[PDB]
Amino acid sequence: AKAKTRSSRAGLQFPVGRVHRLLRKGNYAERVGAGAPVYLAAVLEYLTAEILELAGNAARDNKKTRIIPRHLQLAVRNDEELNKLLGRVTIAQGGVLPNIQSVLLPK
Amino acid sequence: LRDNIQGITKPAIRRLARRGGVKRISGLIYEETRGVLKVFLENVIRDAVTYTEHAKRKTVTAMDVVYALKRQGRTLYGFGG
Amino acid sequence: RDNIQGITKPAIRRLARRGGVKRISGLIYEETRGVLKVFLENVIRDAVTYTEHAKRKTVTAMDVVYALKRQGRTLYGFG
Amino acid sequence: TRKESYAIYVYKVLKQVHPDTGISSKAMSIMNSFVNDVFERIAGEASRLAHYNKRSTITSREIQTAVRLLLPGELAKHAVSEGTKAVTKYTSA
Amino acid sequence: TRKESYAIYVYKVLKQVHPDTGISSKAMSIMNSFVNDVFERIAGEASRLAHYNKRSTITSREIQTAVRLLLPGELAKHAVSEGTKAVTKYTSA
Amino acid sequence: RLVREIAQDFKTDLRFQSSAVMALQEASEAYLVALFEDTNLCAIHAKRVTIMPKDIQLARRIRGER
Amino acid sequence: KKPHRYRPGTVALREIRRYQKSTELLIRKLPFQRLVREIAQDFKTDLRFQSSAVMALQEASEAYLVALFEDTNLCAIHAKRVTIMPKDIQLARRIRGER
DNA sequence: CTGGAGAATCCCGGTCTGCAGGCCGCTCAATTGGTCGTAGACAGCTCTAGCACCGCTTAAACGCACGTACGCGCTGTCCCCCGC
DNA sequence: CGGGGGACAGCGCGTACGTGCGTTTAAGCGGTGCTAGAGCTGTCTACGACCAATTGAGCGGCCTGCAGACCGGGATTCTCCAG
């Protein structure tokens, strides 16, 4: 029969075959299970969808049609759980959250 | 290459602090900032050069800098991955 | 059921003293209770995760060791 | 020579969720690096899990356990749901 | 069954440095934990280095680089000296 | 008892090795002592000898826990 | 016939707003490269550098400095002050674990 | 309170341009099918420790009285950092 | 370089702390008892490694029109002050 990609078999956008190859080549274990690459690809796809959705929301809020590192940083930092996950990550050209302490406000 | 740490001018540190949310700044801060930055740069560059030498290379790549930053618990995205 | 109140103020005072604290406000104790509770959840969740993945019903010290290690808090003297 | 990345799949997902949104090259590389980092985290945790249990295989159960350990709360739950759904679909088909 | 450790070797080292000092069980348990921690750190860093240069073999050069990266200053220098001397002695022997 | 009570919102009927409990106590006490010392430094920086919970909050915030 | 000068601090707030929205580097590139090469001189001579590397160091250093400044601001405010003192930086670095 | 004044910022056309994204040829990595070896899934056995209980004992926690020093508010001074 | 406003020193206070004594409690210890469950063992079977052949998905190279950047000039807002 004709070749059918495992990504299509599981209905995912990410390359399950490449994931399995990387798993085998990463010296992570002697043998790699059949469904583990599928699980990992699904998880990566879901996380990518989450971050991309938030970044697109931010970019539309800024009224631009392309996502730039600034939008990525805003999306990551504004989300509690994403910021928790990427707590130790530096985003190039990400800028900072526009936060100002109240005591320095002019009174 | 001597006396380059003075290259980080006071307005530069001022801008850095303003991005850091600092409103009023003491005058005896800048040299302390320069010393801390020198320490950080030395710590990173040591490991970067170690990586470059282990590869028997003569130029330092950004990817070496990526590994050095990762080993120090400061992960940076957008420079090769 | 209020085992968080099992952490009496003498124990908190002793820990502060070992920490080199001389004068303690009265509002401190509940703050310590809360922070300790948060720490305990963070560790115990991972410990139970490890216990379950091993398909076991009894939590072992090695599970706690792994949980602490993956949180950046390495512990010796237990394996 | 030729270098591979996750660019095409990221673009596919972007068009899936935001079909009318573009992306710059630098941001694209940022997502590539992010995916690589997550891959390494999950793989290393799974390897440690396998070694702790004296096992020769990295199965989907280990992947799920690593996901639970490395993800915060709702992210972990949704990712577990997605992985289980994808595994079930692949197994059925 | 039987579980291996580093108790005998640590005991011999202690008798070399302090031929009269005893030790408690908790202390040597901490000793074994520390030894395992250092072993894993160095081995993981060496594996990372080997994968970095696209090589299938871990040599003493990789360990030297890993030690230089993990140990601070004088400890690193002295450990490099010890490793080099031991390697040269073993090869000559 | 506190540890066992906490170990109920993840799973029920959890048995415990004693060594796990004592290791938990050791780690918790060490973390608390370190936090106390940081709090002491924070309060001293405010020209005080008495610690109040805002010192703990600032210490945990700078530590990155917050 | 007045100079029409702004009060002390409002300009600082305005530039804080300005620099908390931008993302570009705040340090001159040439002095930073010169300092980086000077520091690297002490580890190995005749060392060449990719430009992407120097940009990587600049980005990482500026991010770390911004984080340290933010922590120092909190430390100084804890002292009920408005101006940053070096003791605040020392305390912040000590608490972080760098000291 | 409250208009003016001046400076700072926003916004809307108008113009240019580098790269985002699409198209294309090719090739090597994914796929399919079949083999074979062996890891672990599973059932079964043992016996360790973890759980529960009970009775003493006594050190520790608790409550409370009491007193003082310290955190905090307030005020005046000056110097030093900011706006230019 | 002018100058204001922030840092800081000094003082009053009252109260929220520390300190000590009488009291109640529950932690700790030792003992007995039970079994759930960790741990170990034999089996085999299904699952993963491995290899040969196929091929098309993805990577490389090219090109382009438009998103976005960059001007400029009014429009609008924010702040300061004198009244």
Author numbering:
A (entry chain I): 12 to 118
B (entry chain L): 22 to 102
C (entry chain H): 23 to 101
D (entry chain J), E (entry chain N): 29 to 121
F (entry chain G): 69 to 134
G (entry chain K): 36 to 134
The authors write:
The Rpd3 small (Rpd3S) complex recognizes histone H3 trimethylation on lysine 36 (H3K36me3) and deacetylates histones H3 and H4 at multiple sites across transcribed regions. The Rpd3S histone deacetylase (HDAC) complex recognizes H3K36me3 at coding regions and suppresses transcription from cryptic promoters via its deacetylase activity in yeast. Here we solved the cryo-electron microscopy structures of Saccharomyces cerevisiae Rpd3S in its free and H3K36me3 nucleosome-bound states. We demonstrated a unique architecture of Rpd3S, in which two copies of Eaf3–Rco1 heterodimers are asymmetrically assembled with Rpd3 and Sin3 to form a catalytic core complex.
To explore the underlying molecular basis, we reconstituted the H3K36me3 modified ‘designer’ nucleosome and prepared cross-linked Rpd3S–nucleosome complex for cryo-EM studies. Two engagement modes (‘close’ and ‘loose’) of the Rpd3S–nucleosome complexes were acquired in global density maps of 4.0 and 4.0 Å, respectively. In this case, one Rpd3S associates with the nucleosome disc from one side by grabbing two H3K36me3 marks and positions its catalytic centre of Rpd3 next to the N-terminal tail of histone H4 for deacetylation. Our structures revealed multivalent engagements between Rpd3S and H3K36me3 nucleosome, including two pairs of CHDEaf3–H3K36me3 recognition, MIDRco1–linker DNA interaction, and Sin3 HID–nucleosomal DNA interaction, which collectively contribute to the positioning of the H4 N-terminal tail towards the catalytic centre of Rpd3. The nucleosomal DNA at SHL +2.5 is recognized by the HID-C region of Sin3 with multiple electrostatic or hydrogen bonding pairs involving residues Q937, K941, H1221, Q1222 and K1244 of Sin3 and backbone phosphates across the DNA minor groove. Structural alignment revealed rotational displacement of the Rpd3S catalytic core from the close to the loose states, in which the MID domain of Rco1-A within the right arm leaves the linker DNA next to SHL +7 in the loose state. The existence of two engagement modes suggests dynamic association between the Rpd3S enzyme and its nucleosomal substrate, which may be beneficial for enzymatic turnover towards different acetylation sites occurred to histones H3 and H4 tails. Moreover, our structural study revealed that the catalytic centre of Rpd3S is far away from the H2A and H2B tails in the context of a nucleosome, consistent with a primary role of Rpd3S in H3 and H4 deacetylation. Histone H3K36me3 dual-mark readout by Rpd3S over a single nucleosome positions the catalytic centre of Rpd3 next to the histone H4 N-terminal tail for efficient deacetylation. Our structural studies show that the Rpd3S complex primarily binds to a single nucleosome through readout of dual H3K36me3 mark.
